[PDB]
Design a protein around this ligand. Structure first.
Ligand SMILES: N[C@@H]1[C@@H](O)[C@H](O)[C@@H](COP(=O)(O)O)O[C@@H]1O
Lengths: 525, 524
């Protein structure tokens, strides 16, 4: 309805007129309201901001000798350095349990092995290692964090610059079981100095495995770090796609006006991988495809896509809207879910999921899921939202597909449903499919045409955290709502009330899934 | 410098309110959300007789959770509001020796005082009125020693009259009530020269007809029903006036307050909190004894009574008794029980997860039941009491649903309602159908609103201090109240009904809502 969007715009335009009147200094808002009634391996070029330059900065990577830290975090930090997005005087500390004598060989052997050895980057590796130190320490001794504090205080007091104190980003590349321990230890032991500096904490998934376990972690952490400080990171959600979702829609009347039940026939969000899970049963078997990427990754995409209009692009305004729309979503039913589990590829190259020492025999863990979500609000009531995720399928692909309702009249078969695709993998692309004339010479001689409207994902998130921008991080309330959307389903699945269909590695998945989709409003182009 | 723009921040709150609620008139809603988005010498408001004589308040069990977290903070609030006499003496009476009474004051009491500015700045002054007294609850000599301590404060009283008034507050297990009352009777009654004696006692008042009557007979040699105040913490003055005045002062409400016009009456008490690890204690009590036989029944009496001969306390109490005597004993077939299980987010563990709860507990944390008031006014009208822990909102209200006018409006009208709500905020309103301007069949449901003071608990203590016993259950009233519930409780304890599990934070068991719909209620 034009009136749904008009009313919001009228409220915002009233709050806007109470803005430029209150620009002349609660009780004044009440009075004004009734009143309105009556009417090449080159040099790193530093792209960092002034404030970023102005105070010291230490990044502490905890669990620095783990696979995530050494293969993912440190390389990501390296790429940001090469991109000129770390402050000049950035200090990095790898905190970990094991004692190390030859500090410099550890950086070279545990860390540099994994750096991007590309042309434009390789030459900067040694430069980056200068900014790194090692810290031997455990994740609970108050002593160890007192010592670390003093190690940081020395580097911060050495900073050659205008502001005192130090900004501190604690990056917990650890198993969630130690999050609370470390967090309290930081709180008691190693917060930024009184004089100045912010404190930020990046934590890694899993964020529980259901409503109850997730809220226990939130409760454990919330004594020590609030939602301005805590950053729950989703490696796979990048700047590029988020901007495509938000900007393309909210900046433009044309897309804004059609982004609703009256115009949209159906929406799919798809996350497909050719890779399987081989030798990862130790993580995956207990998690399943749904907890792994759908409850966390796909649902945040969905929230950004479905949300109502925030009043501004301030992060918490957007996060507020993510929560509101998630709260409109009905808990997913077992009647709206098709599950799969992959067997060996027909060509015998790829082994099945159960064919794995790190997977328990008999496992019914799903590697594939397609489900329908109902968003019960004025904007979305009736519209099918399809989430689809799967391992060992036919191609690597992440995209949003919005199919618009057909204009049957008057072009009939000389036209076709409009679409909007926002694709992130294997490469970024955003387009609309529309119908246009061909130059020749009758009106029903039409064409299908694709208007193109167009640091990696993980890196862009670490950068956002340094910048203090939490837009693309799940907030504590948001996380809780998301868990309530999926947990009843996850229970039904673990109680065996629905079961995975087998599919061979390299196919599309269970044929049943494609029938589900087609039976839930999608029409083939 | 000061580019705070927290303006924008509050604009955001307004926005969220407007779009949540979606008013027709944005402007007028902006005002009402803004105004409702918003130190000094104490002004003595106390009356003539109250300033005339010494007052001493003795809180027995002063280091207990009830006394330090509820009673003493309430007295502080009364003090800050000018509702205690200026020379009031407060005595905390307990059994543990205390080296430093000043530290006790600061650590045991002042910790639970309201941190409100306009109160904080009075705490130290209030503490000057509090003494600690250490003694037993059964030794006459301790009460004589207490009497000496009181007489000393009374005799230094600088106002006109002699002796003093004594309010004894028994924040104790009822097992010690008789021994305290006897000890008071022998040892520290007010001075003969002048002063009254009042005694406030806490629930439970027994746990069935027999235990309760035995308790009343243990106390009546010492205190009569003008001296004895059985306190129900939850019964506020504001609710009671809503119940009494709206009806009895008005022809329109009096005329419809009967079987000819009312389809059903529901009295609801809902909390989001569980038993909070005190399940072991709750388990011997259960929801029916906890709030229904006492609290909801008093609300029912006030709501259902005949017109009092006057608005005097004992005339109201006489009518409370008369109506309760009309009520049939509740049958098990008119009762649905629940027991909560863990909340979705686990913040409320299941009732049975508490290790202090014994395996196999069928204690109800939830109950809905129907009472039949067999009199001319009420014959055939279902009265529903509903109470529940660990449900979906904190809420206390009376809902009166009137009979429908089938003709002529049919589906273009629905049943009128009178709501008197106390929690989470006071409201009272009627829902009637009215025309929309713009088609006789085009109608709207509208709510007519009929409209820091003391809170409900503070109101009752203030009432005891003033001698107003309206909102206190009288001995005879209590007996009758117990005769309504005791058969049912017996059936429950014999295992004849069993509680339906419900998840903490839901409404309760689906069978309870169906029971309500089966006994005369119709959803909007
Ligand atoms: N917008 C991001 C993309 O940047 C990302 O690439 C993709 C997941 O794919 P991958 O797991 O390869 O990052 O979806 C996310 O939503």
């Amino acid at each position: 309805h034009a009136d749904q969007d008009a009313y919001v715009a009228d409220v915002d335009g009233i709050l806007d007129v109470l803005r430029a009147q209150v620009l002349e200094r609660f009780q004044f808002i009440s009075k004004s309201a009734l009143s309105l009634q009556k009417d090449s391996c080159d040099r790193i070029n530093c792209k960092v901001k002034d404030e970023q330059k102005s105070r010291a900065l230490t990044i502490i990577v905890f669990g620095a000798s783990g696979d995530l830290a050494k293969k993912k975090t440190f390389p990501a930090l390296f790429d940001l350095y090469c991109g000129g997005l770390l402050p000049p005087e950035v200090n990095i500390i790898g905190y970990a349990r094991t004692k190390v004598d030859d500090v410099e060989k550890w950086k070279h052997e545990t860390l540099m092995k994994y750096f991007s050895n590309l042309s434009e980057r390789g030459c900067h590796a040694e430069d980056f290692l200068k900014h790194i130190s090692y810290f031997c320490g455990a994740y609970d001794s108050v002593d160890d964090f007192k010592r670390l504090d003093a190690v940081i205080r020395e580097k911060e007091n050495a900073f050659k610059g205008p502001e005192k104190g130090g900004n501190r980003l604690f990056y917990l590349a650890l198993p969630p079981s130690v999050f609370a321990s470390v967090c309290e230890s930081i709180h008691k032991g190693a917060m930024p100095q009184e004089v100045g500096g912010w404190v930020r904490v990046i934590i890694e998934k899993p964020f529980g495995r259901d409503t109850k376990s997730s809220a226990e972690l939130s409760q454990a952490l919330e004594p020590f770090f609030d939602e301005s400080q805590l950053y729950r990171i989703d490696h796979y959600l990048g700047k590029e796609m988020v901007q495509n979702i938000i900007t393309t829609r909210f900046a433009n009347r044309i897309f804004s006006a059609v982004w609703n039940a009256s115009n949209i026939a159906c929406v799919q969000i798809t996350f497909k991988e050719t890779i399987g899970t081989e030798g990862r049963g130790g993580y995956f078997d207990s998690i399943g495809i749904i907890r792994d990427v759908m409850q966390n990754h796909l649902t945040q995409i969905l929230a950004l896509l479905a949300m109502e209009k925030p009043r501004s692009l301030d992060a918490e305004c957007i996060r507020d809207e993510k929560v509101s729309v998630l709260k409109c979503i009905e808990p997913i039913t077992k009647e709206n879910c098709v599950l799969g589990q992959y067997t060996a590829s027909a060509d015998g190259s790829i082994p099945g999921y159960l064919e794995d020492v790190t997977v328990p025999e008999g496992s019914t863990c799903p590697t594939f899921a397609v489900m329908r979500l109902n968003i019960n609000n004025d904007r979305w009531a009736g519209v099918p939202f399809i989430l689809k995720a799967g391992k060992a399928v036919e191609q690597k692909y992440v995209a949003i597909r919005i199919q618009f309702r057909d204009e049957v009249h008057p072009y009939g078969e000389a036209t076709q449903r409009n679409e909007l695709v926002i694709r992130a993998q294997p490469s970024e692309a955003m387009y609309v499919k529309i119908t246009t004339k061909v130059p020749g010479g009758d009106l029903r001689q039409t064409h299908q045409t694709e208007l193109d409207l167009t640091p990696d994902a993980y890196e862009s998130l670490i950068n956002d955290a340094l910048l203090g921008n939490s837009t693309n991080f799940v907030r504590k309330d948001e996380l809780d709502v998301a868990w309530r959307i999926f947990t009843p389903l996850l229970h039904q699945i673990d109680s065996g009330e629905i079961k995975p269909i087998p599919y061979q590695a390299g196919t599309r998945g269970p044929k049943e899934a494609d029938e589900f989709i087609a039976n839930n409003g999608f029409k083939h182009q």
